[model samples]
Target: KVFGRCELAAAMKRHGLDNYRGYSLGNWVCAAKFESNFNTQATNRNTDGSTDYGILQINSRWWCNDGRTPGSRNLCNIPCSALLSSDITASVNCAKKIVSDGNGMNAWVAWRNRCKGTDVQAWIRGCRL
Candidate 1:
């Protein structure tokens, strides 16, 4: 279990995700809040039978494999479980790589629905980071 939003922000900053690939800290904070509420073990099964893993909710179709499927993009070259750890290193790195390809934060549906063109400064208001 993690501590608080500020702590998660700190971790994201440490992992260079606060402004990852030109996206702002607000972008990531809002992404985390909606994507997984900062819960490392969060996962969601898609209608297509793929799964989203971790705080950023990286998808099985293009990110990692949960091993249930034999072949996947595995772009991050990691098991989906790697994103479910408190460590955040693999998740952070994978998220970085995912965003690097294209779309920026638009890679996440939640980001588009909840954060795009919205004021997300509150995500880091009192974090002091």
Candidate 2:
């Protein structure tokens, strides 16, 4: 599904996650850009055969249940398919919960490998809310 960075930023602001619990909007947007390019339908197949789902790329191995996987930790208690919807409310809420669990935005490997510690102001430049 198509989603814009600005709209994502607004949602983050509305959810109080822009700067909530030590995570920054810029960092999140950067991770979204790197993780899934803001596509809600995005999914990644790991070499280990597990999958990551949605904008924040929440992993089936640890976070959400993909159904294809019988036994997941499923901390979010959501089906991974739910994360693929254009409406990101569930994904956003799940992400907030993930951050609160002490992983922060660093839960996504994309954030740690690419989006972290970079000049990310451009991610939220025109998307100021």
Candidate 3:
């Protein structure tokens, strides 16, 4: 569970800007929370049993571009060469792109508007210091 919410949050804190530059890191954190319960080591064999992958619950059967899942290593999930990969900031960016529809961070404002009465805050709650 290295890249769980806490782990990803820590990574964002370590590598991201002071208050998040691009998308809603907190929102993405919330999505990941509901997806895998903050278990980076989490994986899933979908109903079709096709894809299986990493932290953000990214399906390897989709388009990970990674080769395979070896022993206890997960560097494949962490796209080091590419700028915006998946199961991380890259994955979050993809979602944000869809959510914002090119409107940028305003998606968060909308999400805040839409996610009013649900468990939307599960992933991002207390993320702020």
Candidate 4:
């Protein structure tokens, strides 16, 4: 499902992403905007043969297993397909694991380039979170 800005914010907040690992809710919301534009079914195949999945675009190379990415570690222990589901629970859990694993939100290059160190709060501005 494609989520609106405030809708995604509320969903992530309910799942504990508001301040997960020191990232503001807006930071995550900003990252999602650039990574997948809030589309739960988004997927991008990398040149290295790994695929990124879900709204946050968790990768198959080291996170989820797609049964196609070579040498996948599947550290998140979830099927890549789960990331595509509109439910988003598996996606949020894997994202938390990614941050807790010391990768921080920088695990996503889009976050680094687009959401990092900026006025991220603007992303959630006026959202009734």
Query: TM-score, each model?
Result: 0.94, 0.91, 0.46, 0.97
From the highest TM-score down, the ranking of the candidates is 4, 1, 2, 3
Per-residue alpha-carbon lDDT of candidate 1 for residues 27-112, written as tens digits (9 for 90 to 100) = 88788889999898899998888899888899999889888754668988998999999899998899888888877778899999
By summed lDDT, the worst window of 10 consecutive residues in model 4 runs over 99-108
Pick out the ten consecutive residues of candidate 2 with the lowest summed lDDT: 64-73
Q: What's the best-to-worst order under lDDT?
A: 4, 1, 2, 3
> Which regions of candidate 2 are displaced past 4 Å?
none
In model 3, pairs of residues that clash are none
Instruction: Write down the lDDT of every candidate, Cα atoms only.
Output: 0.86, 0.82, 0.46, 0.92
- Cα TM-score of candidate 3: 0.46
TM-score of 2: 0.91
lDDT, candidate 4, 2-112, per-residue tens? 999999999999999998988999999999999999999999999999999999999999998999988888998989999999898998988999988877988889999
Best by TM-score: 4
The stretch of ten residues in a row with the least summed lDDT in candidate 3 is: 75-84
> Candidate 4: which pairs clash?
none
Q: Candidate 1's C-alpha lDDT? A: 0.86
lDDT of 3 at 19: 40
